[PDB]
Design a binder for this molecule. Structure first.
Ligand SMILES: CC(=O)c1cccc(O)c1
Length: 425
C-alpha cells in the first residue's frame, strides 16, 4: 500500500487563548519523548461530504480554543524542566490518500503498519520544533477513512487526549462543549519537602530471563464473547474461593502469557497495569483535568503458581496492587519522583515488557467509539501500532454485544499457544 499526502497544514485556535507557560508535574515528565500513536477507522455512510476536511479543521480550531495547550510547543525553563509554551502555533493536520482499502487491515491488529496512517515527526530538530498533536485523515480506495493521532504525552495522558478528540467530533456535529477542560497541573505538585513513604516497587528492576534471544515479535487481536467473559467471571468460585471482570480478565491474560511463553516453574514475572489516579487522588481532581494522571500497579508472581492455581489467584494479586494505590500512595509517588535525578530514565521500554514480564491497559471504560464527526462512530479504534513484545490492550466492542478484544504483542512462537490458552474458559 502506498500513501500520499494531498495537503498538510497547521490548525490554530479559532479565537484568542492565554499566552502562558504551562507547568508540568512529575507525572507529566515521566513520559516518552515521541508521539503516542492511535488510529480510528470509519466505514462510508453514503454521504457526499464524507469526512469533509473543512468541517474537520473548522471544528478542530474551535476545540483548540479551550484545549489551547494542545496547540502549543515544548520548552524548558531555566532549570531545564520541560514545560508547555502555549503559543498557539497550531497542531498538524494532514490529508492523505491510500491506494488500498480499509479491509486490507483485516481484524485491525495493531501492527506497525498503522504508523503510516499517522504523521511522522522529526525528533532531531529540538523538542520545540514539532506540534504536540499530529493528525492524519486518510482516504482509502473503498471510501473508508482512518483518523491517525500522534499525541506528545507531555501535553496530557490518553484520557485527556480522548477527551479532546471526542470534543472535536462533538463540535464537528455542531454541539457545544459538554465537559470544559481544567488546566492546572500544580495540583500534582510534590510536597515541600518531599516525603516519600514507600520504596515504590513500581520503579524497581523487573524479573529477568537468565538469557535473551533476539525475538520475532508479532501482533494479534482476539475477540472474547460476553458468554466467555461471564464464564470467566464465575471461575472465582473455583477451589472454594468476588473479583471484577477486569481483574479476572487481566489475570487470565497474565496467566495465559506465562504459559504461552513456556516460562520455567520458578521464573518470576511482573505485571504492569495502567491505572487512572483521577479516581483515587484527594481532593478529587476537577472534571476535565487536562494532563497526565496515569500510574502503574505492579503485582509480582511466580510463573509456576499462576499456572497451577486458578485465575482468581492472579486476579487477587492484581486487586491487591490496585487497592493499595490510594491517595497516600499516589502522593508518596509524587514525592519519590521529585527526589529522582532523572525522570526520563524511569520511562518503561521494550526491556520492561520483555519476557517474562507484561504490560496491560484496559480501554473498555473509555468512550473510545464516541468520536462521531457527523458520519458515524468509528468502526474500530486502538493503539497505532505496537513496536515490542509484552504489551496488551483490552478493547471494548463498537457494537452492543458486550464482547471485547485483546490485542497483544508476543513472540511469533508464543502467539500460537496464547490463542489456545486464552479461549480455555
Ligand atoms: C500503554 C500500556 O499498555 C502500558 C502498560 C503497562 C505499563 C505502562 O506504563 C503502559
Amino acid at each position: 500500500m502506498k500513501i500520499h499526502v494531498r495537503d498538510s497544514t497547521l490548525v490554530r485556535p479559532s479565537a484568542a487563548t492565554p499566552a502562558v507557560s504551562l507547568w508540568n508535574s512529575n507525572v507529566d515528565l515521566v513520559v516518552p519523548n515521541f508521539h503516542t500513536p492511535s488510529v480510528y477507522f470509519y466505514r462510508p455512510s453514503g454521504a457526499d461530504n464524507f469526512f469533509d476536511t473543512a468541517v474537520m479543521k473548522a471544528a478542530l480550531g474551535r476545540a483548540l480554543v479551550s484545549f489551547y495547550p494542545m496547540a502549543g510547543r515544548l520548552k524548558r525553563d531555566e532549570d531545564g524542566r520541560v514545560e508547555i509554551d502555549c503559543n498557539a502555533e497550531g497542531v498538524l493536520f494532514v490529508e492523505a490518500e491510500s491506494d488500498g482499502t480499509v479491509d486490507d487491515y483485516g481484524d485491525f491488529a495493531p501492527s506497525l503498519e498503522l504508523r503510516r496512517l499517522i504523521p511522522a515527526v522529526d525528533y532531531s530538530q529540538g523538542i520545540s520544533a514539532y506540534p504536540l498533536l499530529v493528525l492524519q485523515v486518510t482516504f482509502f480506495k473503498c471510501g473508508g477513512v482512518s483518523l491517525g493521532v500522534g499525541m506528545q504525552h507531555h501535553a496530557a495522558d490518553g484520557f485527556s487526549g480522548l477527551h479532546f478528540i471526542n470534543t472535536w467530533s462533538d463540535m464537528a456535529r455542531g454541539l457545544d462543549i459538554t465537559l470544559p477542560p481544567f488546566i492546572d497541573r500544580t495540583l500534582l505538585s510534590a510536597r515541600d519537602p518531599p516525603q516519600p513513604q514507600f520504596k515504590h516497587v513500581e520503579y524497581q528492576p523487573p524479573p529477568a530471563m537468565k538469557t535473551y534471544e533476539p525475538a520475532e515479535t508479532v501482533v494479534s487481536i482476539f475477540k472474547l464473547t460476553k458468554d466467555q467473559l461471564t464464564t470467566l467471571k464465575a471461575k472465582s468460585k473455583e477451589d472454594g474461593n468476588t473479583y471484577s471482570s477486569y481483574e479476572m480478565l487481566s489475570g487470565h491474560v497474565w496467566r495465559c502469557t506465562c504459559l504461552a511463553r513456556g516460562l520455567p516453574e520458578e521464573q518470576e514475572t511482573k505485571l504492569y497495569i495502567a491505572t487512572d489516579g483521577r479516581s483515587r487522588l484527594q481532593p478529587q481532581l476537577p472534571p476535565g483535568y487536562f494532563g497526565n494522571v496515569i500510574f502503574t500497579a505492579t503485582p509480582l508472581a511466580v510463573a509456576g503458581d499462576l499456572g497451577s492455581k486458578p485465575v482468581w489467584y492472579a486476579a487477587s494479586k492484581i486487586h491487591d496492587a490496585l487497592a493499595r494505590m490510594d491517595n497516600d500512595y499516589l502522593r508518596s509517588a509524587l514525592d519519590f519522583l521529585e527526589l529522582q535525578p532523572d525522570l526520563k530514565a524511569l520511562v518503561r521500554g521494550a526491556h520492561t515488557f520483555r519476557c517474562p514480564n507484561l504490560g496491560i491497559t484496559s480501554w473498555v471504560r473509555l468512550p473510545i467509539h464516541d468520536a462521531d464527526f457527523g458520519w458515524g462512530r468509528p468502526i474500530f479504534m486502538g493503539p497505532g501500532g505496537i513496536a515490542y513484545e509484552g504489551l496488551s490492550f483490552v478493547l471494548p466492542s463498537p457494537t452492543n454485544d458486550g464482547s471485547l478484544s485483546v490485542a497483544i504483542s508476543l513472540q511469533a512462537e508464543h502467539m500460537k499457544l496464547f490463542e489456545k490458552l486464552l479461549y480455555q474458559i
